[PDB]
């Protein structure tokens, strides 16, 4: 079908040398791949759907001119959204970069019931509504 | 076979024979008038043919809802899950223009009494709480004696008339508050909680006060229940028209010459009704503006309608408005009718108890605009904003206090668009 | 005592409303303490007994 006269690659994929990143940020980095924690301030669920990769923390100092802050660390501002965990890892295998992996943290699923608001002998009942 | 017209009632067929105190209303004056009578003896057929009787009786609640009440009395008649079942009586009677069931309560406190044991039974309860409001002080003590007497005669508490059956009768009084008229805002001020309504589908029948089975039922509704088991619900079945079978109470208050409280058949005409008991409009039928055919909560009709409209629950849905507590308010034509509305606006905004946010926001919104348009600082363009408005609040409510809001404003929108277009016409050229 | 008794053991709360209102028949109002006193005799926590006292406009807390 594919008639392209295909070869055998039989090596795990490494692109460490074509990506032209320098070797401080490839050996010295630890990516993180997470799925974000939900903003406790919001009951909004959306930003917690994907993936991401995020980079170690570097330091930040004062501009002695502005007191702005100052940063020597190219990957601060990287963050990468994948589909799924599979992906990421995969994405952070062949650039050569460390990597943690936290497992999503889905909520339990929860018995809700409005009626036991007003139970005859339980604790649940309450006291204001 | 059936009847096409209907009124005129015998006072044979009256079952509030007491109705203007006029007689003892102690328990000799109720027995001498038949209360009490072979009480024993419709307890000992069971709650089965109790039920049986207010079922073929059609009878429907006399509160403002009008649903079947041999029909919603059947889901306390389940088997005990451990729990004790109780019987709530609504004494609120807050709806404006509503004057029945103070008469029931203070001139026959004894077919109450006699109706709470045989509802009471029917649902198999073991004591009936009756919430009466709090500022009919003088009419819960004539209660409270009343359910002293039956207490002495052994009509009410261990071994009730003899029949082995428990029941005590338990009387609260409000704190006033209208929207504790509503079943489960009645539910948990005897609880001692604010007078906020629950949500369905957690039933009364099902998890009620103190979160067990509980009956919520009005005075009217419940002080008629042992006539019928007497007489039969053939016999009950025999007035009105088919589904609106009954007697009915009627409280003609406003613009009529002789305001009052009477019985009549449901069914009965509007202007039969205003013209033999409450003698007529003020000025006779010509000075007619609009009738409040249900109290405040049910929307106004217009003179037009009026003429040939009957009072039952069928008649009154098809003429856009309804039966609801049959407080029949009459307004004239000297009337400021924008102005007669806007004051049932403030009532709804005054008494809304402020749990969830239609009515707790959109009660306070309608004042306000309705405050406006009897000045006529408004645009023509805000009538149907005002429309809108009120059509945000019916039925996303918790309870139905906000579609008796919602109503009051659709009626006047609907039949007197041009008297409140013209009074912003007048604003407009004066306040140039 | 006689209104508490009106009501199921282990639901003395139902009681707020009668025991408010007769602490103002005695006295003619509500001052905070009186609410206060409400609240020890029924076991209820006192800002259930604010809630009743202002949301029924019977009771007077002036
Ligand atoms: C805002 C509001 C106020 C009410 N006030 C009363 C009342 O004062 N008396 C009454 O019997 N039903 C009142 N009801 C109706 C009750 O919720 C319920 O429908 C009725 O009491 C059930 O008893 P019934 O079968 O006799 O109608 C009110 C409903 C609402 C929404
Ligand atoms: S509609 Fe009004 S009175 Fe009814 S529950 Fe909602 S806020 Fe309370």
Redesign the interface.
């Known amino acids: 079908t594919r008639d392209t006269q295909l070869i055998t690659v039989d090596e795990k994929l490494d692109i460490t040398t074509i990506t032209g990143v320098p070797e401080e940020h490839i050996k010295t980095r630890k990516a993180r791949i997470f799925v974000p924690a939900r903003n406790n301030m919001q009951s909004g669920v959306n930003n917690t759907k994907k993936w991401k990769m995020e980079f170690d923390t570097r330091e930040r100092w004062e501009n002695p001119l502005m007191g702005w802050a100052s940063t020597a660390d190219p990957l601060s501002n990287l963050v990468l959204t994948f589909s799924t965990k599979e992906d990421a890892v995969a994405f952070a295998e062949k650039n050569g970069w460390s990597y943690d992996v936290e497992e999503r943290k889905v909520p339990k699923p929860k018995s809700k019931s409005?009626?036991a608001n007003?139970?005859?002998?339980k604790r649940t009942?309450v006291?204001?509504? | 076979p059936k009847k096409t017209s209907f009124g005129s009632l015998k006072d044979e067929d009256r079952i509030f024979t007491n109705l203007y105190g006029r007689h003892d209303w102690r328990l000799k004056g109720a027995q001498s008038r038949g209360d009490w009578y072979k009480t024993k003896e419709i307890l000992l057929k069971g709650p089965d043919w109790i039920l049986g009787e207010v079922k073929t009786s059609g009878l429907r609640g006399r509160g403002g809802a009008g649903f079947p009440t041999g029909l919603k009395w059947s889901f306390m008649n389940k088997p005990s899950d451990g729990?004790?079942k109780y019987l709530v009586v609504n004494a609120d009677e807050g709806e404006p223009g509503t004057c029945k069931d103070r008469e029931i309560i203070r001139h026959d406190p004894h077919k109450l009494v006699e109706g709470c044991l045989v509802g009471g039974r029917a649902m198999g309860a073991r004591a009936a709480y009756i919430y009466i409001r709090?500022?009919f002080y003088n009419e819960a003590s004539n209660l409270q004696v009343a359910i002293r007497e039956a207490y002495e005669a052994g009509l009410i508490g261990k071994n009730a008339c003899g029949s082995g059956y428990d029941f005590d009768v338990?009387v609260?009084?409000?704190?006033?508050?209208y929207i504790c008229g509503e079943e489960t805002a009645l539910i948990?001020?005897?609880?001692?909680?604010?007078?906020?309504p629950?949500?369905k589908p957690?039933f009364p029948a099902?998890?009620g006060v103190?979160?067990?089975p509980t009956t919520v039922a009005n005075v009217e509704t419940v002080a008629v229940s042992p006539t019928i088991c007497r007489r039969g619900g053939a016999w009950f079945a025999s007035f009105g028209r088919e589904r609106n079978s009954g007697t009915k109470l009627f409280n003609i208050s406003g613009h009529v010459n002789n305001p009052c409280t009477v019985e009549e058949e449901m069914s009965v005409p509007l202007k039969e009704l205003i013209e033999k008991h409450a003698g007529g409009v003020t000025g006779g039928w010509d000075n007619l503006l609009a009738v409040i055919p249900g109290g405040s909560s049910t929307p106004l009709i217009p003179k037009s309608v009026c003429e040939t409209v009957l009072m039952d629950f069928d008649a009154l849905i098809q003429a856009q408005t309804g039966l609801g507590t049959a407080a029949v308010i009459v307004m004239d034509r000297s009337t400021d009718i924008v102005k007669a509305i806007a004051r049932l606006i403030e009532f709804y905004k005054h008494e809304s108890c402020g749990?969830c946010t239609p009515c707790r926001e959109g009660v306070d919104w309608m004042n306000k605009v309705m405050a406006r348009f009897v000045r006529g600082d408004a645009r023509p363009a805000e009538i149907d904003s005002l429309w809108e408005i009120s059509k945000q609040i019916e039925g996303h409510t918790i309870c139905a206090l906000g579609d008796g809001a919602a109503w009051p404003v659709q009626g006047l929108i609907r039949h007197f668009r041009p008297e409140l277009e013209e009074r912003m016409q007048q604003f407009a050229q004066q306040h140039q | 005592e006689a209104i508490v008794k009106?009501?199921?053991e282990g639901?003395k709360?139902?009681?707020?409303?009668?025991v408010?209102?007769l602490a103002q028949r005695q006295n003619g109002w509500l001052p905070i303490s009186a609410m206060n006193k409400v609240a020890e005799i029924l076991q209820?926590p006192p800002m259930?007994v604010y809630?009743?006292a202002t949301?029924?406009?019977?009771?007077n807390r002036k």
């Not at chain 2, 609260?172 to 508050?177: K, L, T």
């Not at chain 2, 948990?188 to 906020?196: A, C, D, F, H």
């Not at chain 3, 949301?55 to 009771?59: A, H, I, L, Q, V």
């Open positions: 409005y009626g007003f139970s005859w002998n009942r006291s204001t509504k | 729990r004790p709090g500022e338990f609260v009084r409000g704190a006033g508050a948990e001020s005897i609880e001692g909680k604010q007078g906020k629950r949500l957690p099902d998890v103190f979160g067990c749990q | 009106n009501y199921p639901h709360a139902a009681a707020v409303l009668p408010l209102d209820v259930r809630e009743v949301f029924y406009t019977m009771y």
